[PDB]
Design a protein around this ligand. Structure first.
Ligand SMILES: CC(=O)N[C@H]1[C@H]([C@H](O)[C@H](O)CO)O[C@](C(=O)O)(n2cc(CCC(=O)NCC[C@@H]3O[C@H](CO)[C@H](O)[C@H](O)[C@H]3O)nn2)C[C@@H]1O
Ligand SMILES: CC(=O)N[C@H]1[C@H]([C@H](O)[C@H](O)CO)O[C@](C(=O)O)(n2cc(CCC(=O)NCC[C@@H]3O[C@H](CO)[C@H](O)[C@H](O)[C@H]3O)nn2)C[C@@H]1O
Ligand SMILES: CC(=O)N[C@H]1[C@H]([C@H](O)[C@H](O)CO)O[C@](C(=O)O)(n2cc(CCC(=O)NCC[C@@H]3O[C@H](CO)[C@H](O)[C@H](O)[C@H]3O)nn2)C[C@@H]1O
Ligand SMILES: CC(=O)N[C@H]1[C@H]([C@H](O)[C@H](O)CO)O[C@](C(=O)O)(n2cc(CCC(=O)NCC[C@@H]3O[C@H](CO)[C@H](O)[C@H](O)[C@H]3O)nn2)C[C@@H]1O
Ligand SMILES: CC(=O)N[C@H]1[C@H]([C@H](O)[C@H](O)CO)O[C@](C(=O)O)(n2cc(CCC(=O)NCC[C@@H]3O[C@H](CO)[C@H](O)[C@H](O)[C@H]3O)nn2)C[C@@H]1O
Lengths: 103, 103, 103, 103, 103
C-alpha cells in the first residue's frame, strides 16, 4: 500500500501529479443524463473532472467517486488548499484519481 | 467531454444558461408525496426547481439529483455565489441541470 | 408544479402554512424503535415533528424524509432563519411537509 | 406521538433522562469489527455510547442509529449544547436512545 | 463494551494507541481502483490509512469504514484536535481502527 499521493499515483498507467497548492477557483456539477460529473478549476487555468461512472470503473470505485465529489464541494466551500491532484491524463479534462489537502 | 457548464448545457435540447453571480435568496424543500423537490430563488426574482425524480430521468441521474439538492442547501447556508445555472426551459419552474460556483 | 412553499402546501389536504421567520429553538431526534423521528421547536412555543416513516408514506417519500431531518439538523446548528413550514395539521405534533429558508 | 424527549423517553423500559446542558467534551468512534460504535463524554465525567447494531434493534432503527452518530459528530465539532439524553440504563456505557439540543 | 478508545483498542490483536493531541496536517483520498482509501498525516510526519475494504473486514465494518473517512475529512477541515488513534500496526501505513477527539 502506498504511503502518500505521489506513490499512489505511480501505481497506475496514464497518470501524473499536479502540485496546485491552492484553493479551488470554481466548482461545477451536473445531474444531466450521461454527464453526471463534477468539474473544478484553479486560478492557474487548470481544469479537472470527476468522471462519469463508466465501464472502466470497477464496482469498488463507485462509492469513492461519490465521496470525491463530496470532498471537492466542501473543499471549494471551505476554501481549503489543495496540495496535489493525481489525475489520469488520457482524458480531457484530466480525470481526478486522488487528492491531497494540506496547509 | 465538456470542460465547463456552458458547453455541457449546450449538449441537450431545451436548455439554456442563466448567469446569476449571486448567492441564493431562498431555499425550499418538500417531502410531500409527488412533490419531493427543492425550489431556490434569487434576489432578481429568478425561480428554479430540482425536479421530482421520474421516468424522464435515466438511472444514473438519481444519485446526481440527490447530490444537487445537497449542493443547493449547503450553497444557501454558506451564502456561496452561484455563477451559472444550466436549466431545462420546458418545465415551470425551469429545472436545474447543472450549477457552477466561483468567488 | 408549484413555484413556492405556499402554493405547494395548497396541493394537499390537511395542511397549513406556519410563518416563523425565526431560527429553530431546539432540535430533538430519536433512534428508539417505533419513534425514529425528529422534533423541532421555536421560541414562540411551536412544536413540529418529522414523522416516523409509515404506511401513509409512498416510497418516493422515504429519501425525502431522511433529507428533511438532515436539513433541520443543519438549520438548527447554523441558526438559519426558517421562513415558513408547510405542515399536516391532522397529527400531533403537526408534521412537517416542507420548509422554506430566507435571511 | 410524544412532543418532547422526556415524554418519548418514558415510552420505553429501562430508560432515563440525563440533563447535561453542556457541549460534548470528547467524541470517539470505532470501525473495529464487533465495536462499530461511538462513545461521547462530558466534562462532568459522564460517558455514553451509541450501541453496535444488534438483534435488539428492529429494522427501522438501523438508519436512525447511523443518523445519531452523524448528529453526535457534528454536535461535537460545532460545540452544540446538548440539553438532554434519553438513555438505556441496562447497558454500560448507558446507550443513547434520543438527544435534544437547545441553549 | 469499552468506555474509551484505549480500552477498546486493547480488545484487538496487532493494535496500539498513538497520542497525537494535534489537528490533522494533511488529508488524502483516492478513488483509484484497488486503492479506495484515505491517508492522513500529522505535523510530526506520522502517517495513517483508512484501509481499502478487504477480505479481512466483516460486513458490519463496511459502513463504519465509510463513516471514518467522513470523520477524518471533517476533522481535517475544522482543524479538530485528535486526541488518540487506535491503529493496526501490522499494516503500513498503520491502519486506523478508532479515533478520539477532545479539545
Ligand atoms: C494499484 C493497482 O491495482 N494498480 C493497477 C491498476 C488497477 O488494478 C486498476 O486501475 C483498477 O481498475 O490497473 C492497471 C492500471 O494502471 O490502471 N492496469 C489496468 C489495465 C487494463 C485496464 C485499464 O487500464 N483500466 C483502467 C482504465 C482507466 O480507468 C480510470 C478510472 O479508474 C480512468 O478512467 C482512465 O482514464 C482509464 O484509462 N492495465 N493496467 C495496472 C496497475 O498496476
Ligand atoms: C450528452 C448527451 O447524451 N446528450 C443527449 C441527451 C442525453 O442522452 C439524455 O438527456 C439523457 O437521458 O439526450 C438528448 C437531449 O437533448 O436530452 N435527447 C434525448 C431525446 C429523447 C428522450 C428525451 O427527450 N429525454 C430527455 C427528457 C428531458 O429530461 C430532462 C431531465 O433529464 C428534463 O426533465 C427535461 O424537461 C426533459 O425534456 N432526444 N434528445 C440528446 C442529447 O444529445
Ligand atoms: C401533489 C399531489 O399529488 N397532491 C395529492 C396528494 C398526494 O398525491 C399524496 O399526498 C402523496 O402520497 O394526495 C392527496 C392529499 O391531499 O394528500 N390525497 C390523498 C388521498 C388519499 C390518501 C391520503 O390521504 N394520503 C395522505 C396521507 C397523509 O400523509 C401525510 C404524509 O405524506 C401525513 O402523514 C398526513 O397526516 C396524512 O393525512 N386523498 N387526497 C390529494 C392531493 O391532491
Ligand atoms: C413507543 C413504543 O413502541 N414503545 C415500546 C417499545 C418499542 O416498541 C421497542 O423498543 C422497539 O423495538 O417496546 C417496549 C420497550 O419498552 O422497549 N418493549 C419491548 C419489549 C420486548 C423486546 C425488548 O425488550 N426490546 C427492547 C430491547 C432494548 O433495545 C434497546 C435498543 O432499541 C437497547 O439496546 C436496550 O438496552 C434493550 O433492552 N418489551 N417491551 C414496550 C414499549 O411500549
Ligand atoms: C471485540 C472483538 O470481538 N475482538 C476480537 C476481534 C474481532 O472479533 C474481529 O477483529 C472482527 O472481525 O477478533 C480478534 C482480533 O484480535 O482481531 N481476532 C481475530 C482473529 C482471526 C482473524 C483476524 O485476525 N481478523 C482481523 C484481521 C485484521 O483486520 C483488521 C481490520 O478489521 C486490520 O486490517 C488488521 O490489519 C487485520 O490483521 N484472531 N483474533 C480477537 C478479538 O478478541
Amino acid at each position: 500500500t502506498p504511503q502518500n499521493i505521489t506513490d499512489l499515483c505511480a501505481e497506475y498507467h496514464n497518470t501524473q501529479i499536479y502540485t496546485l497548492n491552492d484553493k479551488i477557483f470554481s466548482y461545477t456539477e451536473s445531474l444531466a443524463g450521461k454527464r453526471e460529473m463534477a468539474i473544478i478549476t484553479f486560478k492557474n487555468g487548470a481544469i479537472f473532472q470527476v468522471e462519469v461512472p463508466g465501464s472502466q470503473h470497477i464496482d469498488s470505485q463507485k462509492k469513492a467517486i461519490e465521496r470525491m465529489k463530496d470532498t471537492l464541494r466542501i473543499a471549494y466551500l471551505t476554501e481549503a488548499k489543495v496540495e496535489k491532484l493525481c489525475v489520469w491524463n488520457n482524458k480531457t479534462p484530466h480525470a481526478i484519481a486522488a487528492i491531497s489537502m494540506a496547509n
